[PDB]
Design a protein around this ligand. Structure first.
Ligand SMILES: C=C(C(=O)Nc1ccccc1)c1cccnc1
Ligand SMILES: C=C(C(=O)Nc1ccccc1)c1cccnc1
Lengths: 304, 304
């Protein structure tokens, strides 16, 4: 027992990290097969970032301007192209450490692990959620661009995120591996509104189920609610409205614990309306929304 | 910016994980050079665990009884020996993936990453602290024994923990890599007192410094305190007494922020006496003690 904010083992992704330099800028790249993916802003100077014309800036660059180094070894760049906000650098050598992989576009509310990197070197790994407003609250400093987010299903790495930007608010924005930003963001040093964010209701319920499985049960009560009544409270507290699709995804946890989803909703309603009263749930003094129902099942069953 | 409970990249450790089976019991082993380390209780049945005579149980076992499998490949065991609560199985092949490594015994209050494993396969990675009472609050299910804790200094992996047991209270106990338990614990299915635990004061202060660096400053006040006065409050709230050695280790953070350590102690004093008033610090509604001053500096500087 015990419940932790667990990340996937990062080994398969560490083997793909490279450093990419163009002019004065250095960031991280992801080397899969004979292609290195990286943020297209590697071609910008600080003069350019206020309003970059990426097509024009890329035209000034040749294959030999992109310096790609896999730890100690230099890769030979034989092609380059921009797809949305990413650059794809074709190299003459397939990465011998390429794992089985997919590129996926995750949905808001889903979770993933991030391998934070600097100069193509891995520094740390952490788990996070894609916020409903398509930002992530990460830990990224200058030079971390190109660090990636991913999930692992046995031996397959599904890459879902590449880091591009820190908004003036200190929250993070990035793209899928085809270079499409999550949310309304553009890769320009301009003030950009991240929409109103909400709490991921289905994940808070999943985490309350993880709390019950792991012995924290003080918040269970004698009440029940309906989706309609619960959603009036979710509205007041800036929580995502719960749907039957969310109830269905919580089915395994409801079956394992014997606590009907609407009964857990009534515990969540009382916690929203009353607070914790100075108590904790799984070592947290707030309602945690960074574990999906799949994460709770995976962690409570020991999936490798 | 941003601050996360970050674990070390687990790749170097994933390459060392193996499965060890003896009789009916399967757990994880750590393969470094030509030795596989694992909990000695791999030789017990459930009948034995209430009061095992490990010397007698090991005498019934031969090299060929220890089945060691590195993913798909079987290792040939040419020797076995018990050192404290670990078994060392000499194999005929050095692990080709052995990183530069050390065995270290960490101090209470220090942090490390755990690579939770099942059947020799890595499932997830998380960061945690060794509690002042020598327990860890991990996420471990049956079959996770033999999973290890570690720190990484550039290319050197310092292994500090091997998981052995879950106490009836749901907290975790284990050993250094020479098989010595941290704390008073013994590898026997018996009720065992974990001492009174305390909050790691120096880590809470380090985390308050991380909060200031990352823009969360609401808790800063117009007060100061002394070590003596602060320690009267630490005593009341079950916090470790702060020493000049702790103040010295916070020197880099005090220098970076310009906030004298005793001034940060006065902010901590007010937070202990007043609570958070429904506010958060770095996304937490409680005072976090799982980041050391070294962790905060490492995360705020981008160490790879
Ligand atoms: C330098 C960063 C950045 O935001 N670049 C950028 C700025 C605007 C548009 C595109 C790229 C940065 C700093 C900290 C964390 N992550 C990223
Ligand atoms: C089976 C476990 C265990 O505690 N074994 C053990 C029990 C007593 C002494 C030695 C070994 C276990 C379960 C969950 C998490 N971690 C470990």
């Amino acid at each position: 027992s015990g419940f932790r904010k667990m990340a996937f083992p990062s080994g398969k992704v560490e083997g793909c990290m490279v450093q990419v330099t163009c002019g004065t800028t250095t960031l991280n790249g992801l080397w899969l097969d004979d292609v290195v993916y990286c943020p297209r802003h590697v071609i910008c100077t600080s003069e350019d970032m206020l309003n970059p014309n990426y097509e024009d800036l890329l035209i000034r660059k040749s294959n030999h301007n992109f310096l790609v180094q896999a730890g100690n070894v230099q890769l030979r760049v034989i092609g380059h192209s921009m797809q949305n906000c990413v650059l794809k650098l074709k190299v003459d050598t397939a990465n011998p450490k390429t794992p089985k992989y997919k590129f996926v576009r995750i949905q808001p509310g889903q979770t993933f692990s991030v391998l934070a990197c600097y100069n193509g070197s891995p520094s740390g790994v952490y788990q996070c959620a894609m916020r409903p407003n398509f930002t992530i609250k990460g830990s990224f400093l200058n030079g971390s661009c190109g660090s990636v987010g991913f999930n692992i299903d046995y031996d397959c790495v599904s890459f879902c995120y590449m880091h591009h930007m820190e908004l003036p608010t200190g929250v993070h924005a990035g793209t899928d591996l085809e270079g499409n930003f999550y949310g309304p963001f553009v890769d320009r040093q301009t003030a950009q509104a991240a929409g109103t964010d909400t709490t991921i209701t289905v994940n808070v319920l999943a985490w309350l189920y993880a709390a019950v499985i792991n012995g924290d049960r003080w918040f269970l009560n004698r009440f029940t609610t309906t989706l309609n009544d619960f959603n009036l409270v979710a509205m007041k507290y800036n929580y995502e409205p719960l749907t039957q699709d969310h109830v269905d995804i919580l089915g395994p946890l409801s079956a394992q614990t014997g606590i009907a989803v609407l009964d857990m909703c009534a515990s969540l309603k009382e916690l929203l309306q009353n607070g914790m009263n100075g108590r904790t749930i799984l070592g947290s003094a707030l309602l945690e929304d960074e574990f999906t129902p799949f994460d709770v099942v995976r962690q409570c069953s020991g999936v490798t």
